[PDB]
Design a protein around this ligand. Structure first.
Ligand SMILES: Nc1cccc(-c2nc3ncccc3o2)c1
Length: 1105
């Protein structure tokens, strides 16, 4: 009935978990990071983190632990998903190919069972005897680790303690033993049990229970030789080992709850601890010797090390390097020093990794140019709060601009053999060459002895033996560096024109029609080595040396006319090693051998904007795994360049692109420039690490931004942003923010709301939240003004609009007065503000008897939701809000969107409702509601007949009118899809410059994932649904989870297959399967579709984000 397509624009960035161990090999130290559905694998080096493999799971990662059974040469990986898919995984690398093998899998959900409120805990016995899971209160699930248990069959043990806080397996025990903290009416306690595989039951544990602190929250299992357990609370740290009990109460930890730990030393002598304010501590266990050679714990000390991002997880990585995994801010690599700095910190940040999450609100604005949307998010929380400005494509920073038309090629060179930097740029034109010298920033015409100016140059550069080369249509010219003189000249035997040229430091291959000549560069000598006659006219050549080659290529890559082939030839014989026919009647224009992330590729661009690429074996010359993308509609010219110590390929066309590698796959990112015809890298005194760019009329010099799909600007607020709106007439944003103060109440640090240029305060008629409206400049993101709300006043909703016949644009804020014992608020305000002359003036107020959860401008009026009421206000001539009409049939109306006279209302627990304003009756009519209960997080109107909801269990659904009257009032859920993210905000718009899809809705999530929803025809839906089913038969999923299971709508009330939703991430993955697989997919598929049809289809779909 409705057909929707959902695709990832930005993968989740929040770190949900981290572990270290030896997974990729026994001798590698690995960091594994869980980002919701993604697992990232790194090798830890001196240099830092090298990425080796990133995979997606068809599940949310809830447990991630490395372990090593006897007989295994390296660690295996246990994963449990939030839908209770369990697997054991093994890393396998066969040559260049890397695969995650599933050693065991099965689903471990029970039939009855309310998910424990305090979440899934999974733990692994140190001796790998069993995996233990706390999934539900009152039960402990055991998976025995026998070699025969490939289905991960489990049994449940009754657990008398219903409210477990945390649990670990202990070290040094003859039977598998758990230690856990639990809560009962008498307080919190620590207890142990042995786990008997024979009896499938608990036995008495080795040490008796103790009462612990009221807020004891984490258990640490300390390795031998200590053994035992550390229990971390809010004001105490205790150690237990039976006839051993030791407790400290250090004041230094009392300010903020400690929420994560990591073992620094294998023997447990030191642990890192992180708290909710980003403090990093070291916990030190002091040893005492004993006559019998055991070691017991003498004392415990805690030392403040410094400050990090607020850590969800910590991993020590050796040599003082710590990974800080953050959910609420950026993740980091930090270094711990033995000696402190000026301010007394041992912590120095080394590297920052972007986290957009949580995205709590966002808007789309054309900040810089018309038609180019940028997303501005409210990101992070507490000291990590920020605005983030997100935009597609890679920028260039122009540093020079010369009027100079007709350029046909650019080459840099070093005219001085004693200087490392380029000082010369050679330009070709039709039939001519010009040399430009660079003196700092000055760029000046000149001659260069040895080079000719009256022929077109096809290549020039530095070559071996301190020489320069120029290849023109007439000859190859070899020039000495000191002095500049012609030392050798090569011409074809009858002096026919050269038509194509390739060159490296010591080798030359030139074409003359169908003839090829191979030359070597020697001292004062161009030596002709060999020649051949190709079957067809030569279109393009490359001899870029790859790998451990010593600057020499044994291969020549060639593109031919007529048969449209890309071929690899051996030098010097010119023997054919491999031929690929590219199809069509349009010749290759650019061919390049290149390396990315240590793998070799052949790139071949046609004159129609097609780019083919292949794996290249530089030993055998074999091309494999052909792929194709379209980079424009014009001939593309390819050229290698380096930035940030990485070689990439710049593709010149009508749509300039950078080609690079990410997770050992080629990626393509737009450069934000108009048409570029030619380019070369340029690294001169005045223009270090730059690019020279030419179009039809202009030569530019500039630097390039980071090579990535999306560019992100961060604006730190040092406090929690809550909502955002743009006010075009003021050229600024309004942002609701809150900061924590401690009760007179005192602030913890300066932040946006206490550092505005000017400030104002409302006048009345982790201790406390103080709320503010910030006014922020759209260009500088400076905080121009901050208005502080009343004590106990929480700002919930924000809109920028005009009302009635009043020409002013206002910022309007809806609030709640929050008191401790109230089930919900019974008081709040709507406040209308005018931003004028650097400050917010209060124009009007309205007291209401509830929380103002949501507001929208509606046909020149103000729509607001207040507790269980939706209300429409008019703006009177006396500049006051006056109630027009009310709707009462809600539990708690949290979310509003409107289109025309229609209003979509999202409820706390009864899903969505459609209202209409009746302009000829001045009131609301309830049109229809979704009678299925759903706990809503966000809503959006897709169009007049289709309503999108997100709910708290990470599902999307789509409702439509069912086209009796009682019947017309029943909205139908026609689309269902498990997304696996928590949606905070939907907003209409696109990051692409303004096909199979209609409409564009972006969403922002808690994990900092950004998605897109668009609409499909029935026809397109049917084709893509068929593709999915076929893809699902050929793709091997990690952990052998079925895609259909993953995407099934799932709440406590209802599990059903997905319907009316295409998984764009799955569809896009078609462009990464093998050619056989594509054939399997494309067989007997409705017109009988071919692989190459689908490739093109999936490209039109990738361009929507
Ligand atoms: N050297 C290198 C290259 C590319 C990506 C990364 C990286 N991205 C991360 N995101 C979160 C946490 C840790 C991370 O490390 C690191």
């Amino acid at each position: 009935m409705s057909y929707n397509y959902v695709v990832t624009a930005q993968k989740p960035t929040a770190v949900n978990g981290c572990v270290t161990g030896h997974f990729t090999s026994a001798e590698d130290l690995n960091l594994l990071i869980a980002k919701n559905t993604r697992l990232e694998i790194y090798v830890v080096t001196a240099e830092g983190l090298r990425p080796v493999k990133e995979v997606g799971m068809y599940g949310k990662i809830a447990v991630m632990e490395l372990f090593r059974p006897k007989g295994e040469s390296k660690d295996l990986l246990f994963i449990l998903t939030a839908k209770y898919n369990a697997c054991i995984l093994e890393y396998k690398q066969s040559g260049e190919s890397i695969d995650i093998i599933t050693r065991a899998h099965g689903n471990v959900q029970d039939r009855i069972g309310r998910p424990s409120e305090t979440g899934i805990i999974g733990i692994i016995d140190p001796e790998c005897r069993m995996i233990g899971l706390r999934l539900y209160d009152g039960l402990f699930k055991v998976i025995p680790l026998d070699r025969d248990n490939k289905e991960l069959k489990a049994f449940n043990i009754r657990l008398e303690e219903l409210h477990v806080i945390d649990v670990k397996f202990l070290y040094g025990c003859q039977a598998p033993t758990i230690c856990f903290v639990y809560q009962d009416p008498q307080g919190r306690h620590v207890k142990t049990y042995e786990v008997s595989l024979r009896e499938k039951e608990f036995n008495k544990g080795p040490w008796k229970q103790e009462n612990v602190e009221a807020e004891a929250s984490m258990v640490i299992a300390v390795p031998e030789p200590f053994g035992g357990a550390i229990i971390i609370g809010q004001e105490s740290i205790t150690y237990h080992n039976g006839d051993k009990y030791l407790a400290i109460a250090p004041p230094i930890i009392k300010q903020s709850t400690i929420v994560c730990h990591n073992r620094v030393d294998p023997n447990g002598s030191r642990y890192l601890l992180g708290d909710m304010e980003g403090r990093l501590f070291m916990l030190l266990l002091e040893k005492e010797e004993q006559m019998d050679g055991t070691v017991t714990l003498k004392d415990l000390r805690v030392e403040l090390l410094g400050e990090t991002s607020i850590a969800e997880c910590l991993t020590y990585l050796d040599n003082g390097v710590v990974f800080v995994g953050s959910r609420l801010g950026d993740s980091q690599l930090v270094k711990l020093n033995v000696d402190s700095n000026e301010q007394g910190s041992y912590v120095v940040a080394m590297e920052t990794f972007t986290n957009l999450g949580p995205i709590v609100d966002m808007c789309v604005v054309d900040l810089e140019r018309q038609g180019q949307g940028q997303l501005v998010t409210c990101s992070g929380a507490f000291k990590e709060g920020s605005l983030r400005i997100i935009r597609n494509g890679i920028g260039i920073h122009e540093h020079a601009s010369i009027d100079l038309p007709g350029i046909k090629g650019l080459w840099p060179l070093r005219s001085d053999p004693n200087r490392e930097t380029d000082d010369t740029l050679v330009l070709s034109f039709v039939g001519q060459t010009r040399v430009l010298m660079l003196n700092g920033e000055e760029v000046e015409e000149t001659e260069l002895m040895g080079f000719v100016d009256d022929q077109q140059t096809f290549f020039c550069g530095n070559v071996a033996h301190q020489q320069l080369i120029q290849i023109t249509s007439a000859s190859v010219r070899l020039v000495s560096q000191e002095p500049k003189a012609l030392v050798s000249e090569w011409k074809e035997p009858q002096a026919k024109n050269i038509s194509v040229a390739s060159c490296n430091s010591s080798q030359v291959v030139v074409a003359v029609g169908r003839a090829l000549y191979y030359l070597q560069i020697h001292p004062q000598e161009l030596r002709q080595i060999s020649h051949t006659e190709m079957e067809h006219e030569v279109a393009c050549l490359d001899i870029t040396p790859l790998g451990d080659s010593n600057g020499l290529s044994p291969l020549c890559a060639i593109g031919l006319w007529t048969d449209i082939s890309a071929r690899i030839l051996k030098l010097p014989s010119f023997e054919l090693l491999h031929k690929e026919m590219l199809g069509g009647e349009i010749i290759p224009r650019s061919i390049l051998m290149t390396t990315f992330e240590s793998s070799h590729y052949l790139l071949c661009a046609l004159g129609d904007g097609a780019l083919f690429y292949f794996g290249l074996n530089i030993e055998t010359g074999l091309l494999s795994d052909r792929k194709k993308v379209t980079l424009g509609t014009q001939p593309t010219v390819l050229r290698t360049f380096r930035s940030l110590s990485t070689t990439n390929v710049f593709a010149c066309s009508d749509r300039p692109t950078v080609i690079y590698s990410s997770n050992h796959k080629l990626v393509f990112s737009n450069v934000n420039l108009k048409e570029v015809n030619y380019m070369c890298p340029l690294n001169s005194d005045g223009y270090p690490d730059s690019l020279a760019l030419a179009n039809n009329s202009t030569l530019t010099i500039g630097t390039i931004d980071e090579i990535q799909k999306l560019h992100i600007r961060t604006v730190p607020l040092y406090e929690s942003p809550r909502k955002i709106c743009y006010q075009e007439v003021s050229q600024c944003f309004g942002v609701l923010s809150s900061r924590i103060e401690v009760q007179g109440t005192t602030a913890l640090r300066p932040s946006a709301s206490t550092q505005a240029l000017s400030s104002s305060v409302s006048s009345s008629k982790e201790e406390v939240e103080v709320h503010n409206l910030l006014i922020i400049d759209q260009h500088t993101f400076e905080v121009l003004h901050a208005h502080q709300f009343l004590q106990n006043e929480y700002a919930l909703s924000l809109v920028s609009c005009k009302l009635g016949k009043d020409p002013n644009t206002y910022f309007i804020v809806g609030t709640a007065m929050v008191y401790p014992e109230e089930a919900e608020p019974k008081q709040g305000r709507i406040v209308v503000f005018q931003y004028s002359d650097g400050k917010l003036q209060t124009v009007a107020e309205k007291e209401v008897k509830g929380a103002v959860y949501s507001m929208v401008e509606f046909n020149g009026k103000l729509l607001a939701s207040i507790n269980s009421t939706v209300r429409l206000y008019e703006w009177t001539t006396e500049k006051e809000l006056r109630t027009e009409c009310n709707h009462y049939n809600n539990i708690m109306a949290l979310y509003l969107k409107t289109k025309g006279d229609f209003i979509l209302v999202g409820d706390l627990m009864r899903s969505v409702l459609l209202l209409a304003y009746k302009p000829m009756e001045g009131n609301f009519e309830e049109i229809a509601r979704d009678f299925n209960p759903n706990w809503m997080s966000a809503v959006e109107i897709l169009d007049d007949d289709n309503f999108l909801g997100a709910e708290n269990a990470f599902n999307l659904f789509v409702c439509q009118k069912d086209s009796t009257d009682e019947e017309r009032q029943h909205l139908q859920e026609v689309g269902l899809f498990h997304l696996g993210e928590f949606v905070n905000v939907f907003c209409h718009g696109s990051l692409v410059m303004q096909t199979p899809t209609q409409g564009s809705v972006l969403f922002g999530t808690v994990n900092g994932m950004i998605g897109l929803v668009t609409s499909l025809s029935e026809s397109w839906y049917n084709l893509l649904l068929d593709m999915q089913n076929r893809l699902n038969k050929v793709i091997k999923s990690v952990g052998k989870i079925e895609h259909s299971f993953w995407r099934s709508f799932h709440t406590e009330r209802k599990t059903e297959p997905a319907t009316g939703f295409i998984d764009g991430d799955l569809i896009e993955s078609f462009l990464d399967i093998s050619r056989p697989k594509m054939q399997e997919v494309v067989a007997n598929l409705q017109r009988e579709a071919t692989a190459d049809d689908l490739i093109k289809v999936v490209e039109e779909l990738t361009r929507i984000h």
